[PDB]
């Protein structure tokens, strides 16, 4: 992740991210709605950070430092490039929706009034089909990935040393190869919880309440198909 985006979401909430004098001019319900929206983007930033760790630090590190069959790397980190491209476009669209909302002469004060359309475009049509088909793949290969890792760690002393070396920095304390895989698998089940809590504080504009309701039913439709498309592969 980039420094600009890290500081923009370094705060524990939206009410702490903006200036205190800017927050004081808004109704409590607006603050409660923006707090949950901010959390959706903050956790989408952490999700893309996790995918970038798998692709650039683990997956890439293994190809250049260790010399193992590239198919073993494909089995260790399945559909990661595709998942990276899917969420980086989503984070890109979420971050520009925040920047458009910025108060003139400020880099921290903003009020996102339209979010629904963005969620509908993401969780519908070809994007939902590509995401459903990618998450179903990832989750079917999830167990085989954890096993293949445990095997490589219990047999290879150079792979054991590589994992000790890359995961030494404190920033990666909760971000090992296995934590990253479950982190990704659990991401899709977060969206309904986040979209339902945004929807709960979005009964101000009717077209917004209907867009957030359509996106809520659209995420659950995706999750139900992802759940129906899982067939666990053995090692």
């Amino acid at each position: 992740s980039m420094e600009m985006d890290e500081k923009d979401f370094a705060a524990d909430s939206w009410s702490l991210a903006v200036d205190s004098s800017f927050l004081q001019q808004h109704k409590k319900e607006v603050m409660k709605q923006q707090d949950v929206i901010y959390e959706l983007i903050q956790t989408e930033l952490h999700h893309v950070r996790t995918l970038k760790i798998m692709t650039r630090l683990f997956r890439t590190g293994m190809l250049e430092e260790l010399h193992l069959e590239p198919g073993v790397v494909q089995g260790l980190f399945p559909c990661v490039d595709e998942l990276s491209d899917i969420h980086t476009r989503f984070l890109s669209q979420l971050l520009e929706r925040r920047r458009q909302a910025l108060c003139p002469g400020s880099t921290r004060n903003f009020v996102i009034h339209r979010l629904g359309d963005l969620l509908i475009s993401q969780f519908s049509g070809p994007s939902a089909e590509q995401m459903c088909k990618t998450y179903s793949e990832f989750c079917s290969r999830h167990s085989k990935a954890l096993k293949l890792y445990k095997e490589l760690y219990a047999r290879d002393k150079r792979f054991q040393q590589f994992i000790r070396k890359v995961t030494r920095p404190a920033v990666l304390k909760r971000h090992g190869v296995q934590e990253c895989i479950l982190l990704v698998t659990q991401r899709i089940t977060k969206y309904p919880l986040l979209i339902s809590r945004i929807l709960q504080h979005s009964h101000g504009i009717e077209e917004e309440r209907q867009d957030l309701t359509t996106a809520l039913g659209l995420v659950k439709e995706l999750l139900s198909n992802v759940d129906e498309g899982i067939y666990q592969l053995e090692k």
């Binding site: 909430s13 009410s15 089940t189 919880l193």
Partner: protein
């Protein structure tokens, strides 16, 4: 420092996300309680042993029976959560959660946790539960459930008042260390 994995299972609004956020932040969030919990690796020293404890949540996976079991691999301790202000969430402990946690995690120590214990002395909770001919889960019913499901132990806590929270995660580490 040994690495042991903790997973918290339980019904929808049983308070497992709140419990996890409160413990990982030491305090109850004053300005904003987050909707989701990603993961946390906690440094716990119990009885003179230093352990690194990964914390995981099954919140959001309750409806997706093919996705949910992907949380279970390599689990060393299970926290089976239920809410004290919802006697119907305890009914699903031996019917729904125990058979699943025993199928995917055989021999893994389970601690039955009674969350929201403060709500026992709540007027609004005692009122709404009485309207359905009910009352908050009594400690004897929690102990009797932990006994019937063959749990390692029974513990009560309150994510809101933080009472009992530190004692659960230390005990979870003691169970995870048992081989």
């Amino acid at each position: 420092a040994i690495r042991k994995k903790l997973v918290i299972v339980g019904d929808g609004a049983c308070g497992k996300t709140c419990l996890l956020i409160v413990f990982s932040k030491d305090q109850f969030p004053e300005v904003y309680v987050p909707t989701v919990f990603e993961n946390y690796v906690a440094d716990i020293e119990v009885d003179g042993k230093q352990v690194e404890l990964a914390l995981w949540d099954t919140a959001g996976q309750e409806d997706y029976d093919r996705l949910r079991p992907l949380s279970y691999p390599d689990t060393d301790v299970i926290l089976m959560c239920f809410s004290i202000d919802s006697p119907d969430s305890l009914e699903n402990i031996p019917e729904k959660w125990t058979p699943e946690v025993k199928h995917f995690c055989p021999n893994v120590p389970i601690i039955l946790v009674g969350n929201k214990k403060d709500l026992r002395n709540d007027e609004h909770t005692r009122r709404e539960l009485a309207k359905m001919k009910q009352e908050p889960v009594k400690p004897e019913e929690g102990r009797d459930m932990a006994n019937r499901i063959g749990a390692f132990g029974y513990m009560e806590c309150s994510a809101k008042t933080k009472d009992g929270v530190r004692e659960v995660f230390e005990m979870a580490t003691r169970a995870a260390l048992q081989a």
